[PDB]
Write an enzyme that holds these catalytic residues in place. Structure first.
Site, PDB file in Angstrom:
ATOM      1  N   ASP A 181       0.864  -1.178   0.000  1.00 47.21           N
ATOM      2  CA  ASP A 181       0.000   0.000   0.000  1.00 47.21           C
ATOM      3  C   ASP A 181       0.909   1.240   0.000  1.00 47.21           C
ATOM      4  OD1 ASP A 181      -2.549   1.611   0.838  1.00 47.21           O
ATOM      5  OD2 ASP A 181      -1.181   1.972   2.493  1.00 47.21           O
ATOM      6  N   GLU A 221       1.984  -0.398  -5.208  1.00 46.07           N
ATOM      7  CA  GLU A 221       1.039   0.652  -5.610  1.00 46.07           C
ATOM      8  C   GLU A 221       2.140   1.715  -5.677  1.00 46.07           C
ATOM      9  OE1 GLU A 221      -1.626   2.355  -2.489  1.00 46.07           O
ATOM     10  OE2 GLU A 221      -3.153   2.349  -4.048  1.00 46.07           O
TER      11      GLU A 221
END
Length: 654
Positions: free
Chosen positions: A333, A368
């Site tokens: 993330d 990400e």
């Protein structure tokens, strides 16, 4: 307390006591805090202090021992030091936490002055634990990146409402490994099950005060602990999870953990004091010149993943999940924080530590590639070991099929594994994790049923969530409508699903998108643990599921999509043809009608009509037959000229 040893990290029992370890560059004294059966607290200074590691040994300490830490040091608001011994802290490497993190005024560390109220009474405690789990013959599937198909799911939402799963295990780690799910996953054809964060997390105070909770879980409080709420047997969740993992591995399915290393549940200076802030705020987090936090994650704080002690901590955490839990990879993330020394560097400490770690360098690494701070946009700039979420594929594909305002060339680019982004270094097409949707944003169905977001349930007056959905409600806002509305968007859903599962790169399918899952217009359901988020199987579409499963199994049969090699002009992997079955010219790529044919490995052809009117497309030489799921198996119809539906597509084989 005995002197003990400055390693390993955390608390480890050895049969004759427990060895406690704790990092802190700026702490002046560390007090191990133990609790008896009367809740009475006993404190002991940690004798050891090797380098920046404080350690000690408690002879005769047995598993099940509740403990916490009390760290003394400077309370300098302006220098970023927040040492406050009045508050019990958690071991950042604790493998099991006892208690819930419910909102409480006693948790706040304090603003300019340390709050002196003791918080022991309501602060979750750490628990010494031993792991004797027998892994038997569990081995990593090591599925080739060229044959990987990821399935993003939420541990609870995936099975909470599944009719075939015994009621007492729905929504738990146990369900992931129940024969019903394993069979479904296999028949659907996915190879990697990616789970939303499972590292023990809490619900932010702002959420609890609104009568909500944190559903996604991107708010870790103990990165070494397995979130107990998703467990059938909380006091022993890890065993349960690993049992599910054995099963999945037996069926040849991998497990990927979505994980956050960029921030903690301590949020900003207004958030609760749990660990890092009181152990070594200055070292753990990125502090600015005024002592406050750098909010590069947009969550309140940003771990300094370039600090050697933090790199040790982080890499040790990743290693723990692989060695003790046997996961097959990670999905990071806001990954840009990992490369952020002050600036993003592909050679940053964490990256080199991960690349040189014999264990971590062996698992799947997905990022990400970005954060929300200036310079945090790192698409295509991650180490060659990492694959990257391709959010531009998400928007490009949506715009191509729902807005009709994307150049034919741009789409052809996204379909070809976005070479202009990963076609560098020694990176392969698989570094491109193509997605049309994910946990954040609209589900696939809502992309064709909503023009606007409907997040009022989140309590922010629709201010939250992305405003760039590139959606098209096809005529009316909301699910349902005339049979025409239903059929018109079924063509788009089929087209978007085909774009996703047939594009070069690594496909990631969002759980529930195979069967019409909707969040009813909410495009940021991070705080919704209820219907509208949980997968409703009793209402799932069997037709779309089979349609999706056929697509995934077709893919495995197309050489150009499984070999994982960049395509070169004329090498046979692909040919781009116009509506007349002719190689597109210069103009056609720029402002020509959005219609083309994509024949791969010269035996498979994808016919595209991304315009608003049914058209005719002349197929290339040969006898072409539509194939499943667009037609029945053993289809005898030979298509010379395809009658293409508006904003639709069909695949053939010769």
């Amino acid at each position: 307390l005995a002197i003990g040893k400055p390693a390993p990290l955390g608390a480890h029992y050895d049969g004759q006591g427990v060895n406690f370890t704790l990092f802190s560059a700026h702490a002046e004294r560390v007090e191990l805090c133990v609790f008896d059966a009367n809740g009475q607290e006993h404190r002991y200074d940690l004798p050891g202090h090797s380098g920046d590691i404080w350690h000690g040994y408690l002879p005769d300490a047995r598993p099940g021992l509740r403990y916490g830490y009390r760290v003394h040091g400077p309370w300098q608001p302006a220098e970023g030091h927040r040492f406050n011994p009045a508050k019990l802290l958690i071991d950042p490497c604790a493998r099991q936490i006892d208690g819930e993190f419910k909102d409480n005024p006693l948790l706040h560390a304090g603003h300019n002055e340390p709050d002196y109220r003791d918080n022991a009474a309501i602060a979750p405690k750490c628990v010494v634990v031993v792991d004797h789990y027998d892994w038997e013959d569990d081995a990593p599937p090591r599925t080739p990146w060229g044959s990987t198909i990821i399935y993003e799911a939420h541990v609870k939402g995936l099975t909470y409402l599944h009719p075939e799963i015994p009621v007492e295990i729905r929504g738990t780690y146990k369900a992931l490994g129940h024969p019903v799910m394993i069979n479904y996953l296999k028949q659907l054809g996915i190879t990697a099950l990616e789970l939303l964060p499972v590292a023990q997390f809490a619900s932010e105070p702002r959420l609890q005060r609104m009568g909500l909770s944190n559903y996604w879980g991107y708010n870790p409080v103990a990165m070494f602990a397995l979130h107990p709420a998703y467990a059938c047997s909380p006091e022993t969740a890890l065993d349960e999870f690993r049992d599910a993992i054995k099963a999945l591995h037996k069926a040849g399915i991998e497990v990927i953990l979505d994980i956050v290393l960029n921030h903690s549940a301590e949020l900003d200076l207004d958030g609760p004091l749990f660990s890092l802030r009181g152990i070594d705020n200055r070292s753990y987090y990125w502090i600015r010149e005024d002592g406050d936090y750098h909010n590069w994650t947009g969550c309140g704080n940003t771990l300094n993943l370039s600090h050697p002690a933090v790199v040790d901590y982080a890499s040790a955490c990743l290693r723990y999940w692989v060695e003790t839990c046997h996961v097959d990879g990670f999905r990071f993330d806001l990954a840009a924080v990992m490369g952020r020394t002050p600036e993003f560097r592909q050679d940053a400490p964490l990256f080199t530590a991960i690349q040189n770690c014999p264990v971590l360098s062996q698992v799947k690494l997905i990022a990400e590639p970005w954060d929300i701070a200036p310079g945090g946009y790192q698409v295509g700039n991650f180490p060659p070991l990492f694959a990257e979420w391709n959010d531009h594929f998400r928007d490009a594909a949506r715009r191509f099929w729902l807005h009709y305002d994307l150049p034919l060339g741009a789409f052809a680019g996204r379909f070809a594994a976005s070479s202009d982004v990963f076609k560098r270094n020694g990176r392969l097409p698989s570094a491109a994790i193509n997605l049309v949707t994910a946990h954040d944003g609209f589900t696939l169905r809502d992309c064709v049923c909503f023009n606007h977001k409907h997040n009022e349930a989140n309590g922010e007056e629709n201010r939250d969530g992305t405003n760039n959905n590139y959606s098209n409600n096809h005529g009316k806002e909301g699910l349902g409508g005339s049979l025409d509305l239903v059929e018109r968007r079924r063509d788009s859903i089929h087209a978007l699903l085909t774009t996703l599962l047939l594009s070069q790169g690594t496909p990631m399918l969002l759980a529930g998108d195979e069967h019409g899952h909707s969040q009813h217009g909410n495009n940021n359901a991070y705080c919704q643990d209820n219907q509208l988020t949980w997968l409703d199987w009793s209402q799932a579409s069997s037709g779309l599921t089979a349609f999706t499963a056929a697509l995934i199994h077709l893919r495995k049969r197309i050489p150009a999509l499984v070999e994982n090699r960049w395509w070169e002009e004329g090498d046979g992997n692909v040919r781009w043809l116009n509506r007349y079955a002719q190689p597109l010219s210069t103009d056609e790529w720029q402002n020509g009608p959005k219609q083309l044919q994509i024949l791969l490995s010269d035996r498979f052809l994808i016919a595209i009509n991304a315009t608003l009117e049914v058209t005719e497309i002349v197929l290339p030489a040969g006898e072409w037959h539509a194939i499943p799921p667009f037609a029945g198996e053993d289809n005898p119809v030979i298509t010379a000229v395809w009658q293409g539906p508006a904003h639709g597509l069909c695949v053939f084989q010769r």
